[PDB]
């Protein structure tokens, strides 16, 4: 069916340029303008500008004059958002939209000088001196990585169902996020539980087993 899919997450250094793509499929690219919308944390949704897909004429919103450009590749039914001389105010999520019923999935742009770094993963277990009730809570501390996005997946016996993913915080330098899972005592440690952490920009992917003590 109809869909606007965009390019992936970008991590750029201040002053660089980023080119976001939006591919349209399922309808005639030329029958709708194509809008771009900025989603900054704390701000809602703001229109950046739109482009006439028949002629290429772009018309910008006042707050987006200068460093921004809208272009298209009609032969590929793709629109582009160009942002040059990136500043921190630019780290946000950008969306393309057409008509009233289509939005791309959005693409996250991070403006930083920090460098891609895999995360260290440390298991979090009860510790000797604790009391054991019917259920037991375990976790995984995913420390010192960059840029954003890591995924933590748990694996054990029975239905964990109780899993919490805690957003990352910038800890003097890098990101640190956390995750926890609660399972019945019968399944752990009498049975193995591990957290699998995936960090895409790093291609790295560590797994740690929760060892009782």
């Amino acid at each position: 069916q109809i869909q606007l899919v965009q390019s992936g997450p970008e991590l750029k250094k201040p002053g660089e340029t980023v080119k976001i793509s939006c591919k349209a499929s399922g309808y005639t690219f030329t029958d709708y303008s194509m809008y771009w919308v900025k989603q900054a944390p704390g701000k809602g949704l703001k229109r950046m500008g739109w482009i006439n897909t028949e002629t290429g004429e772009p018309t910008y919103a006042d707050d987006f004059k200068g460093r921004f450009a809208l272009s298209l590749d009609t032969s590929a039914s793709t629109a582009y958002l160009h942002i040059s001389n990136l500043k921190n105010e630019d780290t946000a999520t950008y969306f393309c939209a057409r008509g009233l019923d289509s939005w791309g999935q959005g693409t996250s742009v991070t403006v930083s000088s920090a460098k891609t770094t895999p995360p260290s993963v440390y298991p979090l277990a009860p510790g000797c001196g604790d009391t054991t009730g019917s259920s037991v809570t375990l976790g995984c501390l995913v420390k010192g990585y960059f840029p954003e996005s890591v995924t933590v997946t748990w694996n054990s016996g029975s239905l964990s169902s109780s899993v919490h993913t805690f957003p990352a915080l910038l800890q003097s330098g890098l990101y640190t996020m956390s995750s926890s899972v609660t399972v019945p005592s019968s399944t752990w440690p009498s049975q193995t539980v591990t957290c699998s952490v995936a960090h895409p920009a790093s291609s790295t992917t560590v797994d740690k087993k929760l060892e009782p003590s």
């Binding site: 979090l124 277990a125 609660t182």
Partner: peptide, 25 residues
């Protein structure tokens, strides 16, 4: 909340770091 505390793991200590964690669920 259901609160749980956790001492640093062996692996982290090995690295020279130490983090104590509390989950309030």
């Amino acid at each position: 909340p259901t609160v749980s505390i956790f001492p640093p793991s062996s692996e982290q200590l090995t690295s020279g770091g130490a983090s104590v964690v509390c989950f309030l669920n």
